[PDB]
Design a protein around this ligand. Structure first.
Ligand SMILES: NS(=O)(=O)c1ccc(CNC(=O)c2cn[nH]c2-c2cc(Cl)c(O)cc2O)cc1
Length: 215
């Protein structure tokens, strides 16, 4: 029978919306740094659970291994980045991925409009948004201990949605699904992914595995 699901639609904070437009509608070379930002964001979450579990071992009930998986899908044109970090509560998602102002947004847009390399985005504290260099739509699935699993999604244009996720359960962590733009499909190629992880993500303190579908 028919199922019902609640959705909540949110507006991006004004300067965050402006940044997204700037990222989306301006040409940048060096778009590859998007993956560095995602792995760094995963690494941040992995540190958080690592140290939490030193206090309370019953925070690792939801899964012991701390790692990152990269999953390209050439048929769907998606690149999926999965971690077993601390995850996000509903309030974490809404606040941290779009509604609360970030202190670095205006500085970064100013820097960028003066010719700064897009690679600086991480240092301005808004690196998540680099996903929109290569992705037309981003879905973030997340599971925090003692909260339910949520899905966040945005195609930009100034809004995002959040809903309880009735899809495949994750133990704990965050899964980012990048629906890549048509001219950005090189980031589905095994060689290219290896190249950029090597160049930009070599000092990560957690194992990363690349899963490649049989050609
Ligand atoms: N939106 S933003 O300001 O650029 C941003 C958002 C999140 C982060 C760091 N990551 C986290 O805080 C976190 C906590 N639990 N899960 C995450 C997480 C978030 C993101 Cl965006 C991710 O791609 C992977 C994650 O594991 C850094 C910067």
């Amino acid at each position: 029978p028919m199922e019902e699901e609640e959705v909540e639609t949110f507006a991006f904070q004004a300067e965050i919306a402006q940044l997204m437009s700037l990222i989306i509608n301006t040409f940048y070379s060096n778009k590859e740094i998007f993956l560095r930002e995602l792995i760094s964001n995963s690494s941040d979450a992995l540190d958080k659970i690592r140290y939490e579990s030193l206090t309370d071992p019953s925070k690792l009930d939801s899964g012991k291994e701390l790692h990152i998986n990269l999953i390209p899908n050439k048929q769907d044109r998606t690149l999926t980045i999965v971690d077993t970090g601390i995850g996000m509560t509903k309030a974490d998602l809404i606040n941290n991925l779009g509604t609360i102002a970030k202190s670095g947004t205006k500085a970064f847009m100013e820097a960028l409009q003066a010719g700064a390399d897009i690679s600086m985005i991480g240092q301005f504290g808004v690196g998540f948004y680099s996903a929109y260099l290569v992705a037309e739509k981003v879905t973030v699935i997340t599971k925090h201990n003692d909260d339910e699993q949520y899905a966040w999604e945005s195609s930009a244009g100034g809004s995002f949605t959040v809903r309880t996720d009735t899809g495949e359960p994750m133990g704990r962590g965050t899964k980012v699904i990048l629906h890549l733009k048509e001219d950005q499909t090189e980031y589905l190629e095994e060689r290219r992914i290896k190249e950029i992880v090597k160049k930009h993500s070599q000092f990560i303190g957690y194992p990363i595995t690349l899963f490649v579908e049989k050609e």
